[PDB]
Structure formats: C-alpha cells, structure tokens
Design a protein around this nucleic acid. Structure first.
Lengths: 103, 68, 166, 59, 78, 148, 131, 279
RNA sequence: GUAAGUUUAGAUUAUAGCCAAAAGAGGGGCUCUUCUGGAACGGAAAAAACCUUUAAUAGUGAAUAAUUAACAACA
C-alpha cells in the first residue's frame, strides 16, 4: 500500500526511486474490470439511421411543416431552433471547398 | 515512457541509459509575417516582413538498456 | 457596346465522338433595344426562370405587363430559329434555362416645370437575355426531410476535430 | 488503445448525464459545480468550440 | 478604496529587503583616508584615452583605384 | 492575413529521410547574355563557383545557355514537380551563390503558414482519455438508483 | 501610368472584404492597413491565450484526480521535475496512466511536505523529499 | 492614349496572367517540353537515388508496349519491360511476404495475401512513381501515363535494380521506399474482414480457447439519440478485449476487432518496424 | 563614479501647452506664482495626465511587477 493514490480504477501505480537516486521508476500495469462488476449484454433483441427514422416519425399531416419539423429535430438533439435555419447564398459560397487534412 | 512503466530524470537521466537519434530533413524559412506599426498617419508603405529561417527534423530511433 | 450573347450562338462544337451522349441544344437569344426598364423587365425574367417553353408562353399570354408581350415575341423567335437552325426535332421540348435583363443606352432631355423648375429627363432602354436548353425543365427541389437534417448534424458532430493539441 | 478512429472520436466526444440532489443543499455551491459540469469544464480536453457540455439533472 | 490583503503583504516584503540593504551598507571596509588617491592613477589613464578618441575627426582620403575600378562595370564575356 | 491567406499542416513528401535522404531539386537552368551589365555577377559565377556546386551535388541537371537576353534568369525544378524561377538581373556572385544554396536545401513543399509544428502518426500510446476513465465500477454493474 | 498596379496591390488584400469597401480604393486601402495592424498585434496575444488554455486543461485533469492545480505544480518543482505546462497537457491527454503516476508522486510529496511541517524538522528528509 | 511602350508591354503580361488563370493549358509531358535530355536525366535520376542502374536495362524497364506502337505508327507513315516486370513483381511478393511474416508470425497466411496485394496496389505503385518523377521518365504513348502501364514499369525498374545492384540493395530499397507506406495504416484498413465475431470464434477453437461471454462493461445514454455502449468479451470470466460502440452490436463488433489485432500481435503500442538496420 | 567640456568662427529653428502632485500668495471652493512628474501595447471598469514598465525581433517556453475591494459594545 505504498502508493499514495487508489490503484483500483486506472492502473496499479508503483513509484520507486533508484538506489543512486538519479532516476525515478514508475510501473503502471493496467487493471481490467471485474466480471462480477459488469452486466451481461441485453439478452432480449442496428444502424443509427434506423433510430433516426423512428425518432423522427411522420405522424400528423403526412410530412410535417417546416416549423414543427425543426421543433421535432430540436427536441431530439436538445438544440435550439436557430441552428436548423438555412443560410443565404453569399455565406454558403464563402465556405472553403477543400480544407486541408493531414494524417 | 513504456507501455507499463516510465522513467523520470532528476532533472535528467544518465547518458548511458538513453540514446536518441534523429535526422535532418529540410532547411527552409517561414512564410511572411506582417510587422505593421500603429502610428498616426500610418501610411500604406510602413510595414516589415520577418520570414525567419527554419529547419525540419525527423525522429529516427530511441535506444535504452537495463543500466539501472 | 458589347454583343457577346450573339457570339455564344455562333459557337461551333467539335464533332462528337461515338462514345459521347447526344449534346443537348443551347440557344442564346436577346433583344438589345427595348423601351422598357430593366428592373421592371427583371421581375418577368425571374418568375419564368426554369419553366418549360409551353408553360412560359401560356403565362405570358395572360400577363398584363408590356414587357411580357415582348418576352413572348422574343421567345417565339428563339424557338423558330432553334428548329430551323439548331436542329431541334420537337417544338415542345424546350425550357427556360436562363432569363435576365440588362441596361441599354438611354436618351437625355431637360424636364421643364410649370413653376420655373427643371429636371433631368431620361428615356430608358434595356436589353433582355435568355438562354434556352433543349429538353423538359429540371425537376423542382424537394425540401429536406427531418431524417436528412438529423443525419447531417450527426455527421457534423463526428467530423469535429480536436483543436490546438498534440 | 487500438480502437477504430471513428469510434474513438465518438467515445472521446461523448456527453454524460449527471444527477444532483438539492435537498438541504445551497444553490450557489451547486450552481458552481453545475456550471462546471454543464459547460464541460470537467473534461481535461475542454475546448471553447468543441461543444463538450454535459447533461445535468437536479432534483 | 480599501487596500487588498495581497498589496499590504507585498510592500512589507519589499521593505524588509531594503532593510537588508541598510545593514550591508553599515560596515564600510575602507575608511575615508584610505580611499583618497587610491585609484587616481587609473582614472587619469582612462581620461587620456577618451581625449584621443574624441579628437580623431578628419576628412577622408581619395584614391586612384576608386576611379579606375569603375571601368570594370563594362566587363563582359569575350 | 491568416484569414485572407491559406495554411497547411506539417508534413513530409514521402518520408524522404526515413531510409535515405533524396534531394528534391532535380534541375537547374541558367540563362546568360554575353553583353549585359545585369549578368556580370552571373558571368563570373560560371567561371568560378558553378563547377564546385555541380561536383558537390551531381544529382541535379544543370543547363547553361548563353543567349541574347535582357535579364538573366534561373529556373529550379523539383522532383515533386514544383518549379521556381529567380531573376538574376544585376546580382553579384555572392548573392547568386547564397540563393542557390537555399534552393538546394528547400523542398518542393509549399511555403505557407503551418498550423502545427508537429506531425505524428501515433498520437496515443497508452490510449486516449475517455470519460469512463477513472470511474469506479459497482458489483453486478448496477446502474445508479437501480433497485435490482 | 502604373496606378492600376498600385490598385491591384490593395485589391489583392481587399478582395475578401464585404460591401463597397472591397471595391472602393478610398475605403479598401484603409481597411488593409487596419487588417495588417490587427494581425501584428494578435501575434503577441496568441501566445498568452495558448498558455491560458493549457493551464485550464491541466486544472481539469488535476481536478479529475482530486488534486488542485497549485498543489501539483509546487510538488513537481520540489521534486526537481522541469516539464513545461504545454508538455503536461500532452502527458495527461495521451498518457493518462503516466499522468496518474505523476499525480501520485506529487501527492506523496505534498503528504511528505505536510509531514515535514508536522514533524517540525526534527525528522529526517523523506525518501521522496531527498534533494 | 497614353504614350510609351513599357506600359503597353506591362498590360500584355496582365492579359496573359488572366488567360492562364481562366483557361489553364492541358497537361503535357516534360519530354515534349523544351530542355529535355533522356540520357542526362537518367544519370541524374540514378545518382539522386544513390543507386547504381544499368542504363541498357533501365531503358528497357522504362520502355512500354504502348510507346513502341506510337513510334511504330510514326515509323510506318526495342525491348518491352514485360520480362523485367515479371521479375520485380514476382520477387516483390516474396520480399513483401517475408517482411510481413517476420514481424507478424501470428498473422494468418490469408491476411498476408491481403496485405501484400494492398502494398502492390496500382494506386500505391502509381503514387510512388509520380512523386519520384518516374512518370516523366516513363516511356509511353499517352500523357498522363496510364496507371497499369506505370505499374508495369515500377516492377520492371525493380528487376533492373536487382541485376544492377543485387538483391541486397533492392531489399533495402523496398524497405526504405515501400515498407514506409504502411505507416499509419491499421490492420483492418489494409485487410478487409467481415463477420469478425465468427472469425474470432474460429481462431479461438483453433487455439482451444473457450468462446468469450459478451458483457456490458459500461453504458451511457441508452435511451437518448446518442447512445454509448462498451461491450467486453469475457473468456472464462476474464476480459480479453473491450470495444466502444454506439449500439450493442457495434460495441460487440468493435470488441471483436480489438481481439483480432491482439491475436495477431497488432497492438497499437507494438514495437515500430525498424528501417535503421544497415544489414 | 563616470565622459564629455571650454574657447573661436558661421547659422538658424523655437519663442501659446495640458493634467497630476508639492510649496507659497490673494479668496475665507476657487485665482495666481514657484518646484517635481507624466503621454502602455499591463493595471485602477471604460480611463492623454494615477501605478507597474529601458528600445524592437521570431518561438504552441520560463520567472516576475502593478493589480475592486474589504471583514451592535460590557468592563
């Protein structure tokens, strides 16, 4: 129990100074989650797109109106309606076509 | 550092323990850097550029031995 | 004065290769001198953009503006040459790809007033430019569904990159 | 480690839901903690433009 | 405007440092008599060098090479 | 200027220095005029220093074409396809030599603002931090407030 | 006779402006100088902003382990650790196991520091407090 | 009308710049463009690479069937690179397979075939050749050079290198120039694996290991529109690999992928391949 | 401790402050005279005049300065 911090979450931490004292030795082997502390995968019986269709169900007046459509979209993602509004041509053209990607 | 252990200098490790080597890739300079001044009647011909020199290095290898 | 719209109609393409789709016809027609305001004529041009040849003609026939009648006459002339000179098989197979109006050279006069005042009188003239593409008008845009909107937002979130870090 | 790039990005950028009990608790101290959790300041990789805020539930 | 707690402490620390300066100025190693004339010789020598440098202004010479070298501007491939 | 100018990330052409370093510059072309004051410095350079550079770097193709020319010019071509032209109009031998040395050292990579001075293909070794890190587990994996 | 090229010099820097400013030389010239002045000033402020971000991220990482930022820094200095603030952020992000090991080392030094104060100096220096 | 000729000349340059910007010219090979000497470039090309090439053999490697037809067509109004192409491609497969096997003995023979094919892909060979100016040095009847023709030359040059410099230099050349391309490439990125769970089970039975019991290590936002699921495969109640997924199936699929990398010794923290060895 | 100074000859420019803070003198807040300091890109909320600040150069370094706050009465 030499370590001053709990070792049960991330990894076992063993801090030791070399005999000469010129170096500090740290051993950090990882710790796995106990089987008994985990739940089994749900036995009762998937692409995220499928959930989106069910979440954004078309129920009233066939396809919903623009405002209600934004409201339904806003509720699902906990976002404001202002985000969903479109933007004009001037700003749309300004966007860089090919942003650089490295690695 | 390693997967399950690390070594710390106090403030540096002994030269014997660790050997690190790298290679020089390119020598270049920097893109222009504006150096305009904030003086009344600034004028359009009152500015300077820096374009400092530059160099490129690629890491090659790291060598260690059990010399604790 | 520049008359590059007509030159666009004088362009001759190279002979098409066997492995090339049949090129759709493009016709550039314009009336350079009209005693009408370009701004007023533009309203007519804006509405008719993207419509079929027959649909535009029908609307023009029941239009009250003087410019609309001129536009119909301009449209008829373009259609006639298209079949006669641009090898258009079907008269109905035409749609309004582009329609716009431009300024023309004007005339200047002094505007007298009954109270001793004077003004600058201008006789406005304008140009009208239209490009016709053989074939039916393209299908109209379909508004994005909620599913489409949500997918883009999720994709944007995934596309987010860590900023200013090793 | 060795995880696929897209899942790794998803996991790192994921948002967590937190529960708070306000019974006999000063709102000001809770608000300071709540602001940290809500704004996403509890994450070591917090960035202003990363929208890393988390859900906070107070009862 | 009430004084912040940090401000009061900072001035006190600086005051103590100045006090240390006072003590080290309280033990003059050399008395006045010893100081007199000890470095006069060095000071005189330095002044002499100063005078020589100050009075070194004069017009510059002119050389034939300058005019003759200008002809090289016409050098070209043979 | 940064908003109005392009930028890139740190990168290497094809990891040139991993196995063996290859000079990006592949061809140098020099145009001269027999009778032109502007080329006087370039005229002397060919006599003295052009040979030394060729011996030092024999992997670059050198073209010297004296011709009637208003302003001497130097063209440098790189392996990646980059081509750069520098005017030698009224420049001395020393100025020319310094420019050539810089050209040889430079690579075909574009010279613009670099967002990051570091490029690595292995950002993480111990694993990237995620929220579940440092979170204690519970027996049976019981979720909070679960009666069970 | 080259006034056009002088305009082009201003235009190339003002092409991305909005309104009549981008097309009026009288206005375009003024904006370009102001934009250049703004960029020059931002160079110094950029470095300071980056340091602030690094400090904030370290505090969040330290607070995750329950350690305050001032305590961690002081203990590392007392331990002859000379890692810079920027590198400290990198270690936490990509080496959480090492960062936790660093946290324990700093915590042990702080505990030794508290022990040293309680000891009143009679006790010898701690194993991790040896300099 | 302003007098003078310098102003008029300056405007002419201005017109040319606009024309180039508006209508960039069609690409043309450097061979057609002025100041091209095939013999001189090859000598510089070899010296730049710090490698020795037999000019006669190298020319044959660059020579392509398409180029001959164009010259023959002009003639109507010579040795191909096929022989060299086969040697380089055939030897490269052995060399590429040998390199992979030594680093990853655990990796199955099927995986090596996929990795070797990816490294010998037309795009990869084309990408290397273009950046090396090999396209300019390539002899072909069409510009840009067709990719399959370019791929033929690249292995043909390898065959010429083998004769000129022997296997030793060529082997280092492959390591320095080709093995470098595998940096930053994940195992499944270079090898396509479907149904990872089934494959993992097949390997486990081969190793006589019990099938792991899938478990839910962590769960977050299950009922939200942004759910996170961590699924860990537990063998004999011991976790072998854990993966993150948005859905339980995705997490299980990702966890299988992690195990497969561990099975074949493809851990992200594995020792990097070494280009330093001079031997 | 430090490096300028005196004389001779020629020669112009400048010749209206501002605010803070001291010492006087009239008023009895002001009105003056005399001495000292100042002109951030930091700070006092924005802040020409107060405080910390020797010039200006690139860097994804480091140590510090001033720095809006402060913790009813019995003997």
């Amino acid at each position: 129990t030499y370590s001053s911090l709990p070792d049960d979450y991330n990894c076992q931490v063993d801090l030791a100074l070399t005999a000469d004292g010129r170096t500090i030795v740290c051993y950090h082997p990882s710790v796995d989650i106990p089987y008994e502390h985990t739940k089994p995968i749900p036995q009762p019986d998937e692409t995220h797109e499928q959930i989106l269709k069910a979440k954004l169900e078309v129920r009233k007046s066939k396809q919903l109106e623009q405002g209600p459509m934004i409201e339904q979209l806003s509720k699902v993602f906990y976002t404001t309606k202002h985000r969903w509004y479109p933007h004009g041509q001037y700003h749309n053209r300004r966007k860089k076509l090919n942003p650089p990607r490295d690695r | 550092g390693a997967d399950n252990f690390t070594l710390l200098g106090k403030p540096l490790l002994r030269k014997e323990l660790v050997r690190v080597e790298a290679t020089v890739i390119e020598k270049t300079e920097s893109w222009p850097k504006i150096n305009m001044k904030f003086r009344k009647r600034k004028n359009f011909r009152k500015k300077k550029i820096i374009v400092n020199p530059q160099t490129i290095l690629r890491i090659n290898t790291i060598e260690i031995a059990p010399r604790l | 004065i520049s008359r590059k719209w007509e030159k666009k109609n004088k362009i001759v393409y190279p002979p098409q290769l066997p492995g090339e789709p049949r090129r759709p016809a493009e016709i550039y027609h314009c009336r350079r001198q009209i005693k009408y305001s370009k701004d007023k004529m533009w309203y007519l041009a804006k509405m008719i953009r993207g419509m079929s040849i027959d649909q535009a003609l029908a609307q023009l026939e029941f239009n009250d503006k003087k410019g609309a009648q001129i536009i119909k006459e301009v449209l008829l002339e373009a259609q006639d040459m298209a079949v006669r000179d641009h090898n258009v098989e079907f008269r109905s197979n035409l749609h309004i790809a582009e329609s716009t109006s431009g300024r023309g050279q004007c005339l200047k006069r002094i505007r007298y007033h009954g109270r001793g005042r004077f003004g600058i009188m201008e006789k406005v003239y304008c140009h009208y430019f239209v490009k016709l593409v053989e074939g039916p008008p393209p299908p109209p845009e379909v508004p994005k569904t909620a599913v489409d909107h949500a997918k883009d937002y999720i994709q944007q979130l995934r596309s987010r990159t860590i900023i200013h870090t090793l | 480690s060795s995880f696929s790039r897209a899942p790794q990005q998803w996991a790192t950028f994921a948002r967590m839901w937190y529960l708070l009990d306000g019974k006999m608790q000063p709102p000001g101290k809770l608000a300071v903690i709540a602001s940290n959790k809500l704004q996403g300041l509890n994450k070591p990789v917090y960035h202003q433009l990363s929208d890393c805020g988390d859900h906070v539930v107070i009862i | 405007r009430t004084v912040s707690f940090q401000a009061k402490e900072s001035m006190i620390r600086r005051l103590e440092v100045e006090a240390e300066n006072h003590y080290w100025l309280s033990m003059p190693y050399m008395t006045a008599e010893q100081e007199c004339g000890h470095a006069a010789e060095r000071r005189a020598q330095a002044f002499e060098a100063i005078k020589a440098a100050a009075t070194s202004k004069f017009p510059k010479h002119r050389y034939i090479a300058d005019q003759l070298d200008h002809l090289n501007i016409s050098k070209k491939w043979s | 200027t940064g908003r109005g100018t392009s930028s890139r990330f740190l990168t290497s052409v094809l990891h040139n220095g991993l196995g063996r370093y290859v000079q990006q510059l592949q061809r140098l072309s020099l145009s001269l005029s027999r009778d032109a004051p502007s080329s006087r410095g370039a005229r002397e350079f060919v006599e003295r220093e052009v040979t030394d550079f060729a011996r030092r770097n024999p992997g670059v193709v050198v073209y010297v074409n004296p011709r009637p020319c208003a302003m001497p010019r130097i063209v440098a071509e790189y392996l990646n396809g980059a081509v750069r032209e520098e005017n030698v109009n009224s420049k001395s031998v020393e100025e020319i030599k310094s420019l050539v040395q810089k050209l040889a050292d430079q690579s075909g990579l574009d010279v613009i603002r670099i967002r990051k001075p570091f490029h690595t293909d292995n950002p993480s070794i111990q694993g990237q931090w995620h929220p579940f890190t440092n979170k204690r587990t519970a027996l049976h994996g019981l979720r909070p407030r679960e009666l069970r | 006779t080259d006034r056009y090229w002088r305009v082009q010099e201003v235009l190339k820097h003002a092409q991305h402006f909005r309104g009549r400013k981008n097309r009026c030389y009288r206005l375009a010239v003024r904006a370009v100088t102001r934009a250049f002045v703004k960029c020059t000033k931002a160079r110094r402020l950029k470095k300071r902003n980056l340091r602030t971000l690094w400090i904030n991220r370290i505090t969040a990482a330290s607070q995750e382990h329950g350690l305050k930022y001032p305590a961690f820094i002081v203990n590392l200095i007392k331990c002859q650790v000379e890692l810079n603030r920027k590198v400290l952020v990198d270690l936490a992000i990509y080496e959480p196991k090492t960062f936790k090991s660093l946290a324990a080392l700093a915590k042990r030094r702080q505990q030794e520091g508290f022990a040293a104060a309680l000891g009143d100096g009679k006790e010898p220096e701690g194993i991790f407090s040896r300099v | 009308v302003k007098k003078g000729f310098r102003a008029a000349f300056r405007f002419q340059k201005e017109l040319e710049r606009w024309r180039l910007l508006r209508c960039p010219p069609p690409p043309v090979r450097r061979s057609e463009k002025p100041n091209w000497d095939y013999h001189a470039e090859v000598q510089a090309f070899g010296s730049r690479l710090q490698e020795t090439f037999s000019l006669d053999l190298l020319k044959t490697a660059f020579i392509n069937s398409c180029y001959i037809k164009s010259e023959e067509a002009k003639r109507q109004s010579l040795k191909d690179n096929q022989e060299l192409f086969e040697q380089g491609l055939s030897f490269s497969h052995r060399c590429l397979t040998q390199f992979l096997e030594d680093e990853f003995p655990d990796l199955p023979a099927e995986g090596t075939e996929s990795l070797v094919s990816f490294l010998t892909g037309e795009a990869v060979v084309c990408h290397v050749a273009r950046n090396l100016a090999v396209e300019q040095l390539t002899l072909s009847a069409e510009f840009p050079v067709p990719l399959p023709v370019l791929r033929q030359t690249f292995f043909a040059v390898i065959g010429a290198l083998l004769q000129s410099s022997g296997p030793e230099r060529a082997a280092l050349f492959i390591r320095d120039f080709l093995i470098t391309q595998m940096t930053g490439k994940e195992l499944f990125e270079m090898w396509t694996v479907v149904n990872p769970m089934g494959l993992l089970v097949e390997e486990l039975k081969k190793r006589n290991i019990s099938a792991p019991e899938s478990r839910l290590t962590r769960q977050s936002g299950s009922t939200t529109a942004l759910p996170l699921y961590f699924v860990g495969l537990y063998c004999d109640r011991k976790l072998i690999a854990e993966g993150p997924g948005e859905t339980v199936l995705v997490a299980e699929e990702e966890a299988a992928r992690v195990a497969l990398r561990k099975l074949y010794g493809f851990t992200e923290n594995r020792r990097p391949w070494d280009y330093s060895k001079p031997k």
